[PDB]
Structures are given as C-alpha cells and as structure tokens.
Design a protein around this ligand. Structure first.
Ligand code: 3PE
Ligand code: PLC
Ligand code: SF4
Ligand code: SF4
Ligand code: SF4
Ligand code: SF4
Ligand code: SF4
Ligand code: FES
Ligand code: K
Ligand code: ZN
Lengths: 139, 139, 160, 160, 115, 68, 86, 64, 192, 124
C-alpha cells in the first residue's frame, strides 16, 4: 500500500489530468470504480485493489482543485463513505428511500465564515403584552 | 391504600375496586397484591395510549397506581361541556367522581363546574386554556 | 494454553509468493502478524409481578445497640433460647426496654455463656470474616503461565 | 478475586505480583495483565450466553420500542422512567471494583427518592498521588517523571 | 511524608488566654511578611498599606466571644497565611483582594429598580 | 485559539458547577468552536481544516496597501 | 446553639442581611427555600429567550425530618426566616 | 447541603484590568428544577427482614 | 474447627513456596564472563530492538486520508441533532417534553401550546450544542422518534452563537439528513 | 401589508411566494401559533445586519403540508386505527371514533380520518 508499483499502476489508470488533481489535494494517487455522484458534484469511488488496507476502500473526488470541504459531501453519501452501509444512495430500494413532502434543493455545505452563517433567535413572542393606551373624555 | 373512586368530600362508591383488603364502603398479603394487579390491568385494558399527548401525564393517578400496585407488562366519542373543560372520554376510568360533584355540590353550566377537572383522576377532563402548555414537573 | 500460533491462522494481511519466503528469512519472529486487518474478512458486513418484585423486598436496615446485644447474652436468642416462660418471661425481656450497659452485663455473667455466644470455638477470638472464602492463590511456573521466566522479579499466582 | 462481580467468577486469569516494588516491577505486572485480559476476552467470546441483557423489570429498565407503542403498561413505564426515574430504597453502600488504575469505589447514600443523597467516589489515583511525596523523595527530577507515569494518574478521576 | 513550608499542626485550643497569644503571634507574622507579599505578588501599593489591610481583618474578629469560633477562625487564618507566603495564590487573586471598595437613598434605588 | 468540546465551548455537563468556567471564550478569544462530547478525531480535523481555510484568506499585507 | 456559625460557614453576608428564608411543610418533610428577589429573579434572555437569573439560591431546597431541625438549623446560620404554619 | 450548586461567584477576563477577576454569579439560563416531580406516593414498601435467627430476641413460651 | 483458635484465617495462609528463595551470588550464574561482556559491550539487545523497529519500516501504515476517506461509523453513532417529520411533512414531535426532562445537561428548552389547526405542537425547541453532552438520552426517550442524532460531526463554527440551535435550525437538519437518518434507524431497529 | 406577516391565522389569504424571505415559512405566509414570533420581527435585529437572509434555515410549515393529504375513509367500520404508518418506527397506536359527521385527525400524525358514508357532507 506504500509501494511505488501501486502508485505507478494507479497513475496509468487515472491519466495525468486526474492524477495531478490527486497530487494536489489527496496527497496520494489512487484509482477506483465510479460508484456515483451526489447533488453537489462530488464523485465517489470504490477500490478493488487487493493491496489497499482496511479503511481505504472508499474515497471521494471533490469538485474544487485547491480547497476541499468535508461538509460539501451530500448526506446520502456521507454515511456510505464512512462504511455505514454497503448500498450507495443511488441503489436504494423504493421502500427504503425516504419520502419527502417538500421540494429538495441543491446540497448546501457548512456556511460558517460566510454571510450565510446561521443566526440564532428566539422563536417565541414576549410573554406579556403591554396595554395599548386609549384616551376617553372626562365627563 | 390505592383508590380511584374514594374521596371523603363525595358520596361512597364501589365502582373502582382498587381499595380491596371495598374498604371505602366497608365500615369499621400476596392475595391483596395479586388483587391490585388484577384490577389495575382491567383499567389499562381499554385505556388509550395517550400519555405523551395527555395533560395528566406527570400528575396521573392511573399512571402512579399502575406503577406502584400493578405489573410492568400487559373508542368513545368526545363531548362538549363548555369552552373551559376539554373532554377526552376515551381515557375515562368510569369512576363517577364527576357525577357526584356536578349533582351534589355544584347543583347543576355553573360557577363551580370547573372543579371537576381536579376530581377527574385521569385526562378525561382537563383545563382547556392550560391544554398542551406545561408539564407538572416544570412548575 | 496460549502458545504460538502461525501467522496464516491470524486475521491479518500477510505476504505471498517469493515475498513470503523473504519475509520468513528476514524476520526475527516470522510467526508475528503485521497487524493490518483483513479487508475481505474483517467487518465486511457493515453494522448498517409480586413474585418477582425483588426491589420492594429489600433487606431492612436493623441496628444493634448495647441494649439489645446485652439481651442476647442474658436472655439468649430466638434460635438458641435461654429465657423463662409466662409472666416471668415478659418480666425478663422488659428489662431490656431501657438503657442497659453491656460492660455491666459482661461483669456478672457466666463465662460459659460469653465464650459460647460472644466468642466462638470455645473461647477463640472472632476473626474478621472474609468477603470470599474461595480466594486462594498458588505459585506457578513458566511452563504453566507462559509469562517471564523465574529470573524476572515477578511471580504468577493461580486460583489453587 | 476478593469480592467477585459480574461473571469474573466464571473465567480464569492470573495475577502478577512483584517482589521489589519499583517502577520496573509494576511495568511487568501491567504487561502480564495485558495478556491476562486477552485470556479473559477469549473466554467471554466463547462463553457468551443467550438471553436478556438488562433486568426484566420496566420500573428500572426501558421497555422495547415495539412493545412501548402497543402496550399501555409499557408506555406508562416508559413515560415514568424518563420523567421521574426510579426510586431506590433508603440506605447506603460502599461498592468497590478492580478498576485498571486500582481500587475504585463509590459511597452512595440513598434517601428513598429518585436522586442520590450523597455520592462519594473513591479514586485510586487520588490515593496514589497522596503518596507521591513519600515515594519521590531522594530521587531526581527525571525520576519524578517515571514515578508519575507508573501511578497511572488521570486527574479527572483524581479531582472529579 | 513531610508537611509543606510554614505548615502548622491543627490543634483545638481550650484556653482563651492561650488562644489570645496564638492570635497575636500570627498577627505579627502577617506584618513581618507584608514586604514579602508586595515583592512576590507585584502589588501596586506600599507594604504600609498591606499592613493596614491586615489589621482591618484582625479588627473585624476582635470581639468574637465563643471559643469554638475562635479555633475555626484561627485555623482558617493560618491556612491563608501558608497560602500567601508559599506563593500558591495566583497574582490576580491577591490584586483583587485590595480592589475591595455611599449608599443610595430610597428614591434613587426606586428609580433604578432597587435591589 | 481552537475551542474543542462542550466544556470549553460553554461548560457542557458541568455548566451549573461552582468551579467551572462557562465557556473558554470568557477568558480568551476563540477562532473556531468544535462541538461534541468529545468531538471525534475527524471532527477536530475538520475544525482545523476550517481554521486553515480562514488562515489562507488572510490579507495582512494587502490590508496595509489598500486599507492603511 | 447560640454560636454564630455564619462567621465560619463561608457564605456571603446577604443570606443574613438581605435574603429571607421560608420554613414550610409542603407533606411529610419540612423544607427551607428562599423568597424570590423583587428584581433579578428572572429576566428573558434577548438572544434565545432563556430565563436568566442572578439569584444563586433559587434552586436550593433544604429538607428536614422535623420542624425542630428546620428552625434550629436556620438559627444556627443566623438566617432571617418565617415559618409557614400548616 | 446549604451551599448552592452553582456557588456565588464566577470568573471572567477584564480587558481594562488585563486579568481574570471574580464577579457575582449571573446565569444566562437559570437552572431548572424538575425535581419538583417527586412522587406524591412512596414507591418502596417496608421491606423484608433478613436478620439472623441467632440475633433475634427469644419469645416467651405459652402458659403451661 | 477453623483457624480461629490461633486468630488465623484461610485467606491468611500464604501458598506453598511464597517465601522468595535465596538470592544468587556471582559464582552462581549460567553465563561465562566473556559471554556476558560480549552481550554488554556489543549492545546485543539494543541492536535487536533496532531490527524490530526496522521491520515496521516495511509494513503497510495505518493512516487514512481524511477528508478524502472516512473512518467506520455505526448506526448507533451520536452526532448532530435533528428534528424529524412524518412522510406527509407533519412534524413528529407532539411537544411532550420527555426529552427536556431526561436531558442530563439541561440543554433542551421547549415551549408548547395549541396550534391554530388545533394540534399539540411546539413553537420553541432549542438545543444548546455547547451544553449538550451528546449522550442520546433525548433520542431514547422520544415516543415518536422526533428527536435524533445524525452521524454528522463536521459542523464546526466560527462563533459560539451558531451552536444555539432553534427549532427552525433543527427542522432544517432533519430535512437535510433524513435519508442518512433512515439508514441508521433501519439498521439499528432490531436492537431498540 | 405587515398583517399577514405578524398575525396567526388558520389559512393564508394570499399565494405564498417562496422567494419572499419575510414569510414565516417558504410555503406559508403567516405564523401558525399564537405565541410564535413572526419571522419578519425576528430578522429585524442587530445580528441580521450584514447576514444573507436567503441562506438562513427555512423549513416548510408542517401545518400546510399535513392538510394537503387526502382524508382517509374507512369502509364498513366506525373506528379508525392509526400507528404512524411505520409500525415500530411510527407513533403509539390509537383508535379514532368516527361517530360524528366530520373528519377527526390523528392525535400524533394529523391524518384526518372519516367514514365513507359521510364523504359528501365533509367534501362540502
Ligand atoms: C579497536 C581495537 C580492537 C579492540 C578490541 C580487541 C578485541 C579483543 C578483546 C580483548 C579481550 C580478550 C581477552 C578475553 C579473555 C579473557 C576473559 C576471560 O577469559 O574470562 C575471565 C577469566 C575468568 O574466567 P570466567 O570467564 O569467569 O569462566 C567462568 C565463568 N563462569 O579470567 C581469567 O582468568 C582469564 C585471564 C586472562 C587469560 C587469557 C589471556
Ligand atoms: C555486522 C555489523 C552490524 C551488527 C554488529 C553488532 C550486532 C550485535 C553483536 C552482539 C550480539 C551478541 O552479543 O549476541 C548475543 C545474542 C544472542 O545470544 P544469546 O542471548 O546467548 O542467544 C540465545 C541462544 N541462541 C544462540 C540459540 C539464540 O545475539 C543477538 O542478540 C543478535 C541480534 C542481531 C539481530 C539484529 C541484526 C542487525 C542489527 C542492526 C545492524 C545495523
Ligand atoms: S390519563 Fe394517565 S394513563 Fe391515561 S393517557 Fe393520560 S397520563 Fe396516560
Ligand atoms: S370522567 Fe373522570 S371523574 Fe368522571 S367518571 Fe370518568 S374518570 Fe371519573
Ligand atoms: S469529552 Fe465532554 S466532558 Fe470530557 S472534556 Fe470534552 S466536553 Fe468535557
Ligand atoms: S444527547 Fe443527552 S445531553 Fe445532548 S440533548 Fe440529548 S439528552 Fe441532552
Ligand atoms: S421526547 Fe420527542 S415528542 Fe417528546 S418533546 Fe422531545 S422531541 Fe417532542
Ligand atoms: S376506593 Fe373503594 S372501591 Fe373505589
Ligand atoms: K384531570
Ligand atoms: Zn396516526
């Protein structure tokens, strides 16, 4: 798993363009079978290489080239990447697939350090209402 | 000595059978423990599974006497009696405490008719303005 | 016993072909596994009433002051009675309804009674009772426990 | 061994005992316990019995969810367990176990309610650190590092 | 084992005359170490002000009558002394000790919500 | 400064204790807060990666040129 | 009995000078709680609506087995107290 | 038992003083007392006696 | 007849051979002087330790490349909280306040009333994530499975305010993570 | 108008525009509870001065979604049984009486059950 034969073998499979991207973020040239792609654009791969060690059989390719944020991974594939399930969310049974009664928009990553960061607030009204003053003529 | 139908401010009843040694009506052990378990199951035979959504939850006499003197293993339409008492008769344990107050003390639509919420040991009759707003351990 | 086990009988990833022979040639202890879990065997399937009311039959906390302890040496016990009968019986027990010093009781009583109840085994002192009477130990040897030989400054104790 | 608890009486293991009472003796003892635990782990894996894992009492343990949503008595016990807890009869206890650091014990006082009246936690590292001045006198500054590490001091346990 | 520096063994004094001498001896030790307190804790006040502060605390308990309260007060005063001399207190705690200090009228408190 | 875990963030289990600071940000400025009791190693690494992302957005020398 | 144990307790002076305690039998034990502050007992947090407080005795409820114990303890601490007769 | 669980004072760093200082306690969310849900009934009974017969007082015999 | 006659005990008896034997002298060794000096001067055991270390240099390391790879997770994992809906879009929580009472850290604040349509619903559900101990008691106590912890762990924030989750934030997490929540519930269903 | 944004009503009087960030929910304009703070008043704070309102969490209102489900109808029975449509992962099972001539919602789900013989009256 640390030999140069594995690296050269994976370098030949991916090509220069894909391997140079792995040489910039991944720190490791790796190859695998495309398993799916989430709604954010990440590509998820699985490795059949017999020399890969236990926890390294699944990996992600991020959309960016210089920065990679783990929160960009869609929740469907977040569980699969962590070996939570052997069924990728693009192979789910009709019964096992969640049913939503609201529209589903594009995956939004963690918004901290941006203007979109979550702002907490009290969702309840004031517990007492002040009297609205009304004046009546004195008889 | 457990009870559901005993209250010294009202007339004597023997329609709950939880005071066996009915000691409430009668003037002055494993069988008794078994008897209390047997009576407790009868009340819970038809009782709806409403404790999470029921206002008597933390202050329910049926709950406490099911825990204390019972085993741990085991459809009536509502009515309207005014905007002050919320009626869910599915939970009634048929103890006739409401009848004794409404006819003997109240004399009835009354200025005291809201006291039946106190006497009803279960969530059959509950305060309507108070509904769903608090739990007795919060107060 | 937990003697040495060959490397191929351990659920790790080893060597193959010419590289296994080389590994056996250059390892001081060649039967030691590499420690890397097997991919094809390890974690392949991913994880994704009153009769029994013993709490309410709890033992009751009962204390023994000098008054009741004196009563046992004087009046005996319910298992080994030494008490009178009738109205005489109730006269003697009502003596221990108020303060009765045990040191005063120990002054005037037959030692044949003290050595039978207060002490044990005919005057033998009462020894601190053990929490587990099955606690025994025995020294063993390296051919048994498999740990360090005798020249190391520790020893191994078995159940005995 | 002294006060067995929770299926330690149904397994086999040996205790390593030193003779010189220094840091090297305790290192060997802790290395033996490594192998004695692995001996127990194998036995438990081969002797795990079937049956319930929690006490069959819904006044202490939560009922299953499937039973909670169909049985009225299960729903009451689930409601009461999570809103009041369970009452514990009044009393007190001093229960000790063989914690990896040493003897860890708790002195719990119950007032008959669903909250503990008093809970004193006896920390093995608290007593070990109270003997450090007696042990470390004479030794040099690098030896204090060894003495600290041979006591297995986790200060959350010490301070709590 | 050995006790830390400036440690005294705890003893329950049963004589008011003997208690009075022990208090006066300790009061002298506070005054003598006053210049040390200014040095170690880097205070912004002269040692003369420190000695004045010490006297005020001793003057607060001047008229305590009960002997059992005297022993507990004396024991706690010894612990504080051992704490200050050995530099166990952090400098922030000693600085705030000298940070300690006209009450408003009824209307003044009424306007701001009082206490 | 990275604040890790519920104790350092806001006190956590010991929030209502007489001897606990209810958040390390009462004493020192905090740049990122990592949640969890404890945060996993990956949760901490993610927090570090967020800080490294913010550090790569620093404009200290262009601040001198364009803001001073 | 008459010892000023508040001098060596370590509690602040306001328990003796300002705060007032109540002794009551609520139905088998006697309890001691403190009367609320006129101001500062509660105030709504503007951020998340939490109930803020500056009353450090708000959650303290002493328990006693007899009426004599509750009164004796309160006097021993120099507390200003009133007994709520049952 | 009379010492409140949150104490009386709290620390914070004072920018003007350049140091950490103690201040009287104030809580953004006061501690909530759910303990008031103490059962109006007793749960455990009177228990079962396990005193050894060798330590119980003897009983007088009936009349001859 | 016990050992109580001599104040003895069964536990007091040391086993046979408990007393340490006589310590050896210089003449009672098994190795010659040159044998012990060759292991000493030539550092026999030190060189062996180096060789063992050099063996590890040729083995596969354990390191995984986070965030491109993730460590294993289980359906019982406790992470970021989220409120859940029924498939129809209705909230599961009936504002029953069970999770508020259980919560060991008192990190949950609930205010409830009657909805306009008449349902027992909450209008205020806050979890202080800087106070929670991620202990799962709220999830275990919920009778409708409304409150859950998702396997998410990567939600670190710049400010401490962002860790004050209100009902809108918690419901948004439930919508975001509903599919991953479904994985854990289905797998962990038999054991709950 | 500021009235449909700060008052609690049974039904919205106008069409909910999901791009309007002043609405209580993307699908509902007015708050659905009397103690619920209007979303317009909540966002008028110092902490929202330089924040992007579009990215703030805005879950859809459950009150609007639950009532778009069709009324369930029972044939040849007077009692409706509901258990969350999930069994062990639904809600506790309850029995709903259908004597009255109206649709009675479930105590947990909110699904409104009715008798088929009462269909025409309820649809009116
Ligand atoms: C860079 C330059 C290289 C430097 C390194 C040079 C390499 C050579 C190393 C020089 C040492 C060579 C001498 C080794 C032989 C002497 C050691 C020896 O013979 O043993 C000591 C001997 C005592 O006999 P003993 O070993 O104790 O046998 C009984 C064991 N139970 O005591 C005796 O009686 C032996 C006396 C000496 C007789 C032989 C000469
Ligand atoms: C060639 C130049 C490099 C190495 C030079 C020094 C090597 C050690 C010499 C003293 C040996 C000695 O004293 O031997 C004493 C011992 C063994 O003897 P025992 O305990 O009685 O054996 C017990 C009975 N048997 C004989 C049946 C086994 O041997 C050793 O532990 C040998 C360890 C060498 C393995 C590691 C080799 C690589 C080391 C790193 C090199 C960079
Ligand atoms: S009346 Fe009591 S037992 Fe029945 S649902 Fe309500 S709380 Fe539960
Ligand atoms: S409605 Fe309430 S008070 Fe009346 S009989 Fe039923 S349980 Fe008793
Ligand atoms: S793991 Fe939890 S209790 Fe421990 S230090 Fe971290 S936040 Fe505190
Ligand atoms: S996980 Fe535990 S501490 Fe966290 S909110 Fe739930 S009950 Fe409270
Ligand atoms: S336990 Fe579940 S239903 Fe009850 S208040 Fe909490 S989230 Fe809502
Ligand atoms: S209390 Fe006597 S039968 Fe009801
Ligand atoms: K009621
Ligand atoms: Zn339903």
């Amino acid at each position: 798993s640390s030999s140069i034969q594995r690296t050269l073998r994976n370098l030949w499979k991916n090509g220069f363009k894909k391997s140079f991207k792995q040489l910039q973020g991944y720190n490791d040239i790796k190859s695998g079978r495309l398993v799916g792609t989430d709604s954010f654009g990440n590509k998820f791969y699985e490795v059949d290489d017999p020399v890969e060690i236990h926890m390294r059989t699944r990996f992600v390719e991020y959309t960016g080239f210089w920065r990679q944020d783990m929160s960009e991974v869609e929740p469907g594939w977040h569980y699969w990447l962590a070996y939570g399930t052997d069924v990728p969310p693009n192979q789910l049974k009709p019964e096992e697939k969640s049913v939503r009664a609201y529209p589903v928009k594009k995956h939004v990553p963690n918004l901290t350090y941006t203007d979109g960061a979550y702002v907490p607030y009290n969702t309840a009204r004031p517990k007492c209402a002040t009297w609205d003053p009304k004046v009546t003529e004195r008889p | 000595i457990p009870r559901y139908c005993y209250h010294e401010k009202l007339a004597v009843a023997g329609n709950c059978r939880m005071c066996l040694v009915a000691s409430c009506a009668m003037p002055v052990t494993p069988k008794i423990k078994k008897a209390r378990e047997g009576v407790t199951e009868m009340l819970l035979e038809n009782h709806p599974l409403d404790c999470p959504v029921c206002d008597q939850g933390g202050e329910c006499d049926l709950q406490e006497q099911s825990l204390r003197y019972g085993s741990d293993r085991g459809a009536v339409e509502n009515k309207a009696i005014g905007p002050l008492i919320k009626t869910s008769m599915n939970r009634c344990i048929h103890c006739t405490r409401c009848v004794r107050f409404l006819n003997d003390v109240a004399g009835a639509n009354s200025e005291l008719s809201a006291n039946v919420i106190d006497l009803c040991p279960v969530g059959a009759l509950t305060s309507k303005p108070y509904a769903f707003r608090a739990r007795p351990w919060e107060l | 016993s937990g003697g040495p086990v060959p490397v191929f009988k351990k659920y790790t990833t080893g060597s193959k072909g010419i590289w296994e022979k080389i590994r056996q040639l250059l390892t001081l202890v060649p039967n030691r596994s590499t420690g890397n879990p097997l991919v094809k065997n390890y974690r392949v399937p991913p994880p994704g009433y009153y009769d029994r009311d013993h709490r309410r039959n709890y033992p009751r906390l009962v204390a023994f002051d000098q008054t009741k302890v004196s009563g046992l040496l004087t009046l005996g016990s319910a298992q080994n009675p030494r008490i009178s009968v009738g109205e005489k019986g109730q006269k003697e027990l009502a003596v221990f309804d108020q303060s009765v010093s045990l040191s005063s009781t120990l002054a005037t009583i037959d030692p044949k009674v003290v050595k039978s109840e207060l002490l044990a085994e005919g005057g033998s002192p009462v020894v601190a009772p053990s929490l587990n009477k099955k606690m025994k130990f025995r020294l063993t040897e390296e051919s048994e426990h498999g740990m360090y030989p005798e020249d190391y400054p520790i020893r191994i104790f078995a159940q005995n | 061994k002294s006060q067995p608890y929770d299926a330690y009486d149904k397994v086999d293991f040996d205790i390593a005992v030193g003779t010189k009472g220094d840091c090297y003796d305790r290192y060997l003892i802790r290395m033996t316990e490594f192998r004695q635990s692995l001996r127990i782990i194998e036995q438990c894996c081969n002797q795990m019995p079937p049956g319930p894992v929690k006490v069959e009492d819904f006044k202490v343990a939560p009922p299953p969810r499937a039973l909670m949503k169909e049985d009225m008595e299960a729903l009451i016990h689930h409601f009461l367990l999570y809103t009041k807890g369970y009452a514990v009869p009044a009393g007190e206890t001093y229960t000790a176990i063989e914690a990896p650091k040493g003897e860890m014990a708790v002195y719990v006082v119950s007032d008959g309610s669903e909250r503990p009246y008093r809970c004193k936690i006896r920390a093995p590292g608290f007593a070990h650190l109270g003997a450090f001045d007696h042990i470390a006198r004479g030794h040099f500054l690098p030896d204090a590092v060894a003495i600290i590490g041979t006591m297995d001091l986790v200060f959350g346990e010490v301070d709590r | 084992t050995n006790p830390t520096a400036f440690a005294q063994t705890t003893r329950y004094v049963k004589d008011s005359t003997e208690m009075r001498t022990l208090v006066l001896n300790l009061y002298r030790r506070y005054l003598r170490h006053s210049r040390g307190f200014v040095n170690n804790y880097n205070l912004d006040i002269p040692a003369s002000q420190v000695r004045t502060k010490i006297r005020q605390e001793f003057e607060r308990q001047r008229f305590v009558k009960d002997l059992p309260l005297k022993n507990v007060l004396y024991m706690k005063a010894q612990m504080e002394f051992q704490e200050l001399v050995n530099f166990w207190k952090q400098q922030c705690h000693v600085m705030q000790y000298f940070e300690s200090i006209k009450g408003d009228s009824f209307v003044q408190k009424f306007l701001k919500g009082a206490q | 400064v990275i604040s890790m875990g519920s104790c350092a963030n806001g006190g956590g289990y010991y929030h209502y204790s007489y001897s606990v600071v209810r958040g390390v940000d009462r004493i020192v400025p905090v740049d990122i807060y990592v949640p969890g009791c404890p945060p996993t190693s990956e949760a901490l690494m993610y927090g570090v990666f967020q800080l490294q992302k913010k550090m790569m957005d620093g404009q200290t020398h262009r601040m001198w040129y364009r803001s001073y | 009995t008459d010892l000023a144990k508040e001098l060596v307790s370590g509690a602040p002076k306001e328990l003796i000078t300002e705060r007032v305690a109540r002794i009551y039998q609520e139905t088998e034990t006697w309890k001691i709680d403190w009367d609320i502050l006129n101001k500062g007992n509660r105030w709504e947090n503007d951020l998340m609506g939490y109930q803020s407080s500056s009353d450090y005795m708000q959650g303290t409820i002493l328990k006693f087995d007899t009426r004599e114990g509750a009164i004796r303890f309160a006097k021993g601490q120099g507390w200003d107290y009133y007994i709520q007769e049952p | 038992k009379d010492f409140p669980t949150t104490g009386y004072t709290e620390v914070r760093y004072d920018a003007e003083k350049r140091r950490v200082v103690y201040e009287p306690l104030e809580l953004t969310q006061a501690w909530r007392n759910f303990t008031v849900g103490s059962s109006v009934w007793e749960q455990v009974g009177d228990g079962k006696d396990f005193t050894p017969e060798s330590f119980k007082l003897p009983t007088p015999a009936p009349d001859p | 007849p016990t050992l109580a006659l001599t104040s003895g005990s069964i536990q007091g008896t040391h086993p046979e051979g408990f007393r340490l034997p006589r310590p050896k002298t210089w003449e009672e060794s098994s190795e010659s002087a040159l044998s012990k000096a060759t292991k000493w001067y030539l550092l026999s055991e030190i060189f062996r330790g180096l060789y063992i270390t050099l063996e590890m240099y040729f083995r596969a390391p354990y390191t995984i490349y986070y965030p491109f790879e993730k460590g294993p997770v289980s359906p019982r994992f406790r992470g970021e909280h989220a409120l859940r809906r029924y498939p129809s879009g209705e909230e599961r929580c009936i504002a029953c306040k069970l999770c508020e009472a259980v919560c060991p850290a008192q990190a949950i604040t609930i205010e409830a009333e009657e909805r306009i349509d008449g349902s027992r619903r909450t209008y205020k559900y806050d979890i202080d994530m800087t106070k929670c101990i991620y202990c799962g008691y709220c999830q275990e106590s919920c009778p409708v499975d409304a409150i859950v912890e998702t396997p998410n762990v990567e939600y670190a924030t710049e400010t401490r305010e962002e860790l004050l989750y209100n009902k809108e934030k918690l419901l948004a997490n439930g919508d975001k993570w509903e599919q991953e929540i479904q994985y854990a519930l289905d797998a962990d269903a038999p054991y709950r | 108008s500021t009235k449909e944004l700060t008052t609690a009503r049974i039904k919205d009087i106008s069409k909910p525009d999901e791009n309007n960030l002043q609405q209580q929910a993307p699908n509902r304009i007015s708050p659905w509870s009397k103690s619920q703070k209007p979303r317009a008043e909540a966002q008028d704070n110092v902490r929202f001065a330089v924040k992007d309102l579009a990215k703030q969490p805005r879950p859809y209102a459950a009150i609007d979604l639950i009532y778009k489900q069709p009324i369930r109808y029972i044939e040849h029975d007077n009692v409706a049984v509901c258990d969350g449509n999930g069994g062990a992962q639904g809600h506790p099972k309850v029995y709903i009486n259908l004597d009255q001539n109206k649709a009675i919602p479930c105590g947990y789900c909110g699904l409104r059950f009715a008798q088929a013989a009462f269909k025409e009256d309820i649809e009116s």
